[PDB]
Symmetry: D3
């Protein structure tokens, strides 16, 4: 069923099981290319889900033949080929604002305390990698691939891939080679490197597994699960001593839940 | 048969400490009838034990294992209830201050392993559940038997792990999709996946073969200069938590005294 | 032989367009790192950083192995005859030497052109400090890596303890390697992720390293060099700080012709 | 003149000189007490000004007898006396969201790259201190006073005072004593401690000086001035080495301005 | 004399409700800090931190002056007869002693009850490490502060070089004080902001220190102790990180009766 | 009259370096006909000078002053035009990379003062404009004459200060309202306000009285153990940039070698 609070041009949001929302990228005719409305609707959607007491986990997938072809290069041209501002300095301030806004599209996934699972089939290109590396857990079909395309287009990726990809897998030689060459990384290598936790034969089976996972997470104490995501995120970005201090301050209130007794 | 020294420095209810060659101490979780469940004395005795080992000039490496059928079942829920079901303080704020102190003190049980400048090797067989994962993620090296499993059980009990797993597990392996899945689902991770993910360094067919390998590793570490090995642990931990530029600065300030040792002179004159 | 590059311990060539190949060149002494080497690396990579024509670098070793590590004769001169009266004064002297030796591999990281290590045979001690300061690592089937410093009576202070734990995931393994000085062979280096590819022999490995450097050089150098700067920044900072930095970085770099 | 983009219940925004906006807290009958609409309108206002190429500096003052009496305690009761959520843990998540939202009310001043000058007469109590310590420059009339009131109300200040006050003046013994006792700090002591840069005999003279300052800042290169605020803010929060690196990366584009040639 | 508090070097009394008064008590030796002192401070402040009845602390010195600083007899035992064979082993031994001595003043900062220093006469060397770990500083007109360590042949390692620069604004002054070991008298301590009030004599100063401790104790202890925790966090972190922390902190602390 | 050593280590166009007692070096900005305007050679020679002083075992403190009527007029706008009016590189991105390198290199001119472990005392008379404020905020101690003024001039020229003022000025004084006002308005701050704000430690009636006081301070610092004084600077700088807990850790690691000096033994045996 269609989730009622959620009406979007570029996204389709459904209740997939109790406490589980399924957010589907929904421009299959355009291979889910990320146009301007997408960047704005993701922010709207995520922020809603974060405030949704009924939602305990999210799955993100793509409609059609592939997860995403990445940024709508028609729309990306409008911003870069006609930039507002007189001299270079004023164009700089303008472009910085744009980059920061697009970063927010994926930040909202991280800021959402409900776990978010990426279920990727077919291509996940450019902006798609910025998306899935901001999700907590990644699954894919056997036909999936991941590509840090930005270098081919003529820029260092700036909406999250270079910030999150190196922190979600161990092999930095591989991270560097993908970012510098824009080569496609296919499903078995995605699994071998730990970019995905599991590979499935096809999209249908992948989606069933991702929803089963989300159902399993939904069965746990929401206070516990959401406190866990908050604290894992914190730990990624701070020393162990700082993160130990933070969890003590976090759980001093959270241990006072009915879910515990 | 193991016999104590004539003046034993280690006498615990929940732990057994033995000497397993020259320079190697073997710390064994020792409540096998309760599957090494971590009760109130355990949290105290671990701090007392590792602080003593830190100051023990003769110890160069430590192995930690569990007695009986499994490494550990985790927190003794009887004793954890006393703290959480009867919390001291009037209102919510005052209860918070009280719980914060308890969390911090329990964190110290495993902080002491990390603060100990001697390498510490976890040798896990059977279940390593909840508290056990907080324990082993604070060790430097992890080995296990074929029958071992690791379980971030806390979410099943109704809390986010707050004594070290969520702070150290994500720093000891590369695959964060896996880290997140384990933490959110409390599922069991068996020995073969633990090796593939890099949570353990080596898997062995049985507890006896594992334990011998862990002691032999400890003995190999104990053969090197203790200045160099202890300096290596200090600097690896510092590097985990700081930028490369800060950590390069730190190691230069650390080694400016540590290079002034006959250990280096003897090691260079030997290889020359 | 590249114009502007002459060294006692290093050989620099530039066959492929935009690509420089830096070769450790004391095969006679297994490319052991003597004093000249520490200085010439700095000179070499600082030149490379300022070369608008260079887009990528490969580093390999002449002869039977990548490197045996530090030349223990020369390391003795510094440590067996240290300048200064008392301990505190000796310490200040040693600190400066450590910091200078760290610069030898720092310059690789400061060079915004990607640097690919191509390792065959042993890569020992100082050689691990070197390759963990490179962006990408390839090796031959005969390769091995060894954090040799504890066997010599010191914690590694040149770079290995600072970069090795950040370039692979398995910390249990990193710790075991650092505490025991044991050799890690090619198959294990591949499986741990220390290297991203293994090749049958030096020749095929070197060819692949250079073909990778060509593929990199086929890209916009603004984009590629901006990628390296931001990957390095991201390693050392929180996600939020690194997102801030990339926005401030690309606000100029997006105004390039290679993009329009 | 009334600024046209700016229509608020709790704020009055005027063009005070070319390139200068004057934002006036506008509930003089309620001593400019900070009610719910205030917290939401400040965010709206600031974010607008940040995107306003015509604006180069801001002055903030209070209508009526005093700068501000602080939080509307009627409205603060609604949030704390009737908190949403079942057990303590769920109330905690609810209250954290509230604190974070109210923090954003003053964050938007800092995030605005135009310099913001606080012109304080009469009382500046509680939330007023959280406000003025998020401004770049502070002026006051001789009758002004500042009071970290929160401890009297029964809480540690959480919307910015404890985070910014210690970073804007040198004397931490004084900072600590104000925060722990909630005592009023009068104008001469505000000047002596450096909390304000200057004191004026009355509100009228204070406001003229603050506008003169803002006019002086407006006369400079906007690229230079706004780059300066960005970089001072950065320097407060990072080491010298990190901040030197950041300014090099910042000015590599900004030095390519027409204002420079 | 407070129940649970007996010490060789310290006297602890509790006249005013919720207030403890800790007095350095070797007037005979100008409250020079001998070995017992280093240990008993830790014992004392850790007890204070766990005392729900205590809301504020004043620290003063018995006799003619606040403190002459470290007892140079006892500091010799540690430095003139250091345990360990070679330099590296001596270093590990010294590092542990430094860290232990730092704990003596760390505990003041970890104590979430505000601690007010009331200084008269000299406050020398170890005494500056002490008072810069306190939240608030008052002094008598005869007081003076002296970063004495360089005169003894060391950089201050107990706390002064870490906290003194963070408690006042004028770094030119902090640097001059640290490099020269010169005395700063009461009028200068007031003008630099090292102390927030100066009083004519010890008696009036002590009275004011205690009246301040009363004023603090008249407030909600949840609010006051939460204020200290968050001020300390804010000193050590960015504004954005500290705003995050206070939100996570108050989400529980706002659920207090002292508020409703 | 000052005479050079028989083998002078300091020979500069833009700087004069003299020895002003035992252990004290006096570095004088020396382009008085151009009001000590910082031209291309100045940025180079400062780096060469301070790196040499850093490695000079006999120097224990440095005073920096200016020749002629004023401390400095700041950047030589002729030479700054060459870099900014004719920037190397095709497009905007390529120009950016070029400017970034120039900014970084100019930052090094003052970084070297900070990296020098000997205390450095600025003795300012007359104007200290733009670049001069970047210079003196990198020094450890600041004195001035009655006629001195400080001016963060950069905004008047059309840029945010990028060679150190905006990174160090806000860390050397407490009043940030004042810091912000100075930076945004480029107004002049006279000697009496500079003292009240704490930017200078002392003000003197004239340049000669100031200069004598600065040398006497340098001589007083030069009377102390160089291990202790140099360790003090290193640790003060580290404390500026790190949390108290990190800085306590650092000083323990630093002093574990530095306490092993006869300087300490002699200082304790003297006072005993
Ligand atoms: Cl994996
Ligand atoms: Cl692995
Ligand atoms: Cl070395
Ligand atoms: Cl891998
Ligand atoms: Cl380039
Ligand atoms: Cl002031
Ligand atoms: Cl000491
Ligand atoms: Cl003051
Ligand atoms: Cl309390
Ligand atoms: Cl002052």
């Amino acid at each position: 069923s269609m989730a009622p609070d959620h009406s979007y041009e570029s996204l389709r949001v459904t209740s997939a099981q109790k406490h589980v929302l399924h957010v589907q990228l929904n421009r299959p005719n355009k291979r889910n290319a990320m146009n301007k409305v997408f960047w704005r609707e993701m922010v709207e959607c995520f922020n809603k889900i974060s405030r949704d007491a009924d939602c305990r986990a999210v799955v993100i997938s793509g409609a059609g033949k592939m997860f995403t072809a990445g940024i709508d290069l028609m729309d990306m041209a409008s911003d870069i080929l006609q930039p507002k501002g007189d001299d270079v300095a004023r164009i700089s301030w303008y472009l910085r604002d744009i980059i920061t806004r697009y970063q927010e599209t994926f930040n909202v996934i991280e800021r959402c305390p409900k776990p978010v699972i990426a279920a990727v089939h077919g291509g996940c290109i450019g902006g798609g990698v910025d998306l899935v590396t901001a999700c907590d857990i990644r699954y894919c079909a056997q036909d999936a691939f991941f590509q840090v395309k930005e270098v081919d287009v003529g820029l260092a990726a700036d909406v999250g891939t270079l910030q999150r990809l190196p922190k979600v897998i161990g092999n930095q030689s591989l991270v560097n080679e993908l970012a510098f060459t824009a080569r496609k990384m296919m499903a078995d290598e995605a699994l071998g490197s730990g970019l995905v936790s599991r590979v499935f034969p096809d999209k249908e089976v992948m989606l069933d597994a991702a929803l089963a996972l989300a159902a399993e997470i939904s069965s746990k104490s929401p206070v516990a699960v959401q406190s866990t995501k908050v604290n894992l995120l914190y730990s990624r970005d701070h020393s162990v001593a700082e993160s130990l201090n933070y969890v003590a301050s976090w759980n001093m209130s959270m241990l006072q839940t009915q879910d515990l007794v």
